[PDB]
Amino acid sequence: YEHTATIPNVVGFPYKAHIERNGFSPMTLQLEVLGTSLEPTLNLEYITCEYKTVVPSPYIKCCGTSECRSMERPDYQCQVYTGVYPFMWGGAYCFCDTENTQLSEAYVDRSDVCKHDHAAAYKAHTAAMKATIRISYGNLNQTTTAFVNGEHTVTVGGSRFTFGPISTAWTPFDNKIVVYKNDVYNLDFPPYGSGQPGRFGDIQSRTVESKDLYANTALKLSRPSSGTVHVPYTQTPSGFKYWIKERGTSLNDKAPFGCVIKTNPVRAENCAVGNIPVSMDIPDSAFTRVIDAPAVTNLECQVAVCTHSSDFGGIATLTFKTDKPGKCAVHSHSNVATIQEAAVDIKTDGKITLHFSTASASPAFKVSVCSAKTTCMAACEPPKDHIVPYGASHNNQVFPDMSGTAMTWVQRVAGGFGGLTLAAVAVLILVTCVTMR
């Protein structure tokens, strides 16, 4: 017997689902959402890290003949200098002055901690969300794990569950992201084509296989002075260090729904948005027939206190005649107010207590006992006046009952002010009909 329902995607929020197939005693289902998560698809464009400026020992050759060459390793700067007269602790070496060759070369490479201190870039895509759900009913209580995608099953027993597609996808991730040591950012990086010398990804090398280490760090050599041996060059500092120093305000403190983010499968956990549908099939052997626990008779309700909106303040009393004791499911039909307790036993006295909660001031819920149902309204005045350190346990819909007991006189005075106009219209019609003749 398939049945459908919708549950708000709020962690730590009990949900009631009552099944009312005829010919059997109606029962209830407790739904709990325990740490839903979301995971996107990754692409791993390229990797960033520091650069090492590999500069070999300078070449002094005392003949004056030039020697120029250029290999294929990245960003050689083929510079040769003539007329240099180097010095050394032994005073000087060689004899000829103004005829010497200085060959100084340098390039860049990755660092030794590139395996560890590197940062990664990724692209966003369609994202699939984990959902860990706890299901319970009469003498059954079990957890599971699903996909809440278009199709999936649970099979907690003889019953099966399917969690339909998500209502919407307000993913905190978007377009392209950067991942670095247990943290992500929504920073637009330059593409693989090129990058500015120092902003970010000055090295835009690909995966750790270390092939085609592109670099645009803008080397520039200079002529050494006549004092001693020199290898002068100009080199802007690494942009990776500047980006690390600035960092700040990680995406963990920027989720638009307070959605704590982890990093192992780059996942985001424990955030509420939209609602999830559900369709469940329950076997006929999971419940008793109508021949058990008939407790209809007559029924009336009373409310003691309704200190509302905090955890549970709606203390209600139910009185009724009944047959032999047994179990009895209870719920609320309307969603104005919601109760906490699931199916509750009945004693021969016929008096039971319920704890409901609401957000309005004149609730008009219809509490239904496992076979009957009656109207039940309360004078729910007292507004709790503090600030709560825990979660909510009711729907946010607040509106006084149309009939109610609070705004009745406002409605009747408005009706009277309308009635004066109606009587004026009627007397005008009478007068004009009389004078038309």
Ligand X SMILES: *[C@@H]1O[C@H](CO)[C@@H](O)[C@H](O)[C@H]1NC(C)=O
Residues in contact with other proteins by the rule CB under 8 A = 253, 258, 308-310, 359, 361-362, 379, 381, 383-389, 392, 396, 398, 405-407, 409-410, 414, 417-418, 420-421, 424-425, 427-428, 431-432, 435
Beta bridge partners of 308: 383
CB of 241 to other proteins, least distance (A): 25
Instruction: Tell me whether residue 143 or residue 297 sits nearer to ligand X (CB atom).
Output: 143
Q: Which residues in 267-350 belong to E strands, given as ranges?
A: 268-269, 275-281, 299-306, 314-320, 331-332, 337-339
Q: Which of 308, 298, 297 is nearest to 378 (CA)?
A: 308
141 binds, options ligand X, other proteins, none, Cβ within 5 to 8 A by partner type: ligand X
136 binds, options ligand X, other proteins, none, Cβ within 5 to 8 A by partner type: ligand X
CB of 308 to other proteins, least distance (A): 8
110 binds, options other proteins, ligand X, none, Cβ within 5 to 8 A by partner type: none
Instruction: Tell me whether residue 141 or residue 317 sits nearer to ligand X (CB atom).
Output: 141
Q: Which of 93, 111, 250, 123 is nearest to 182 (CA)?
A: 250
Residue with tokens 């592109």: 214
CA angle 175/180/183 to nearest 5° reads 75
Instruction: Tell me whether residue 141 or residue 196 sits nearer to ligand X (CB atom).
Output: 141
Q: Report phi then psi at 431, rounded to 5.
A: -65, -45
3-class state of residue 270 by DSSP: coil
Could you say which residues in the range 129-168 bind ligand X, by CB under 6 A?
136, 141
Residue 193 exposed, middle or buried by CB count within 10 Å (0-12, 13-18, 19+): exposed
Instruction: Tell me whether residue 95 or residue 409 sits nearer to other proteins (CB atom).
Output: 409
30 binds, options other proteins, ligand X, none, Cβ within 5 to 8 A by partner type: ligand X
CB of 134 to ligand X, least distance (A): 7
CA distance 417 to 251: 57
427 binds, options other proteins, ligand X, none, Cβ within 5 to 8 A by partner type: other proteins
CB of 214 to other proteins, least distance (A): 38
CB of 312 to other proteins, least distance (A): 14
CA distance 331 to 346: 15
What radius of gyration do the chain's Cα atoms show? 39
CB of 345 to ligand X, least distance (A): 15
CB of 142 to ligand X, least distance (A): 8
Give the residue at shortest CB distance from ligand X: 141
CA distance 309 to 300: 25
CA distance 29 to 20: 11
- Total of residues contacting ligand X (CB under 6 A): 3
CA distances from 128 to 107, 256, 257, 427 (A): 44, 19, 18, 69
State yes or no: residue 30 binds ligand X (CB under 6 A): yes
State yes or no: residue 263 binds ligand X (CB under 6 A): no
Using CB under 6 A as the criterion, which residues of the chain lie in contact with ligand X when the complex forms?
A: 30, 136, 141
